[PDB]
Design a protein around this ligand. Structure first.
Ligand SMILES: [Cl-]
Ligand code: NA
Length: 129
């Protein structure tokens, strides 16, 4: 499913991401935009053999099991395919564990290079929340 900007903001808010660990909603919407262009089915292979899945491009090296990433961890205890669902619950629950890992949203390269330090509130402006 390809989410609308405000549609995703509303969904993330309903799942408790707004201000989660100090990160305002705009941060999460911005990260999703540049990581997957709001597409829940997005996948991207990395040089190390791992793969990134879903709306927030969660990596199989540490967070989910895709059966083809040797010696990897499944910290979120979930098959990576579950992160491609139209229902973002799985991606949100796993993202909460990731952002609490100690490095905050810096775990998402796109957020660090394209959202961090910018006016992220602009991503939820005009939305009925
Ligand atoms: Cl932080
Ligand atoms: Na894994």
């Amino acid at each position: 499913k390809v989410f609308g900007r405000c549609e995703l903001a509303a969904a993330m808010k309903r799942h408790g991401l707004d201000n989660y660990r100090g990160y305002s909603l705009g941060n999460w919407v911005c990260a999703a935009k540049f990581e997957s262009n709001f597409n829940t089915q997005a996948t991207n292979r990395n040089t190390d053999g791992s793969t990134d899945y879903g709306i927030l491009q969660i990596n199989s090296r540490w967070w989910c099991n895709d059966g083809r990433t040797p010696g990897s961890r499944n910290l979120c205890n979930i098959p990576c395919s579950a992160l491609l669902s139209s229902d973002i619950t799985a991606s949100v629950n796993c993202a909460k564990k990731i952002v609490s890992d100690g490095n905050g949203m810096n775990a998402w390269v796109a957020w660090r290079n394209r959202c961090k330090g910018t006016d992220v509130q602009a991503w939820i402006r005009g939305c009925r929340l």
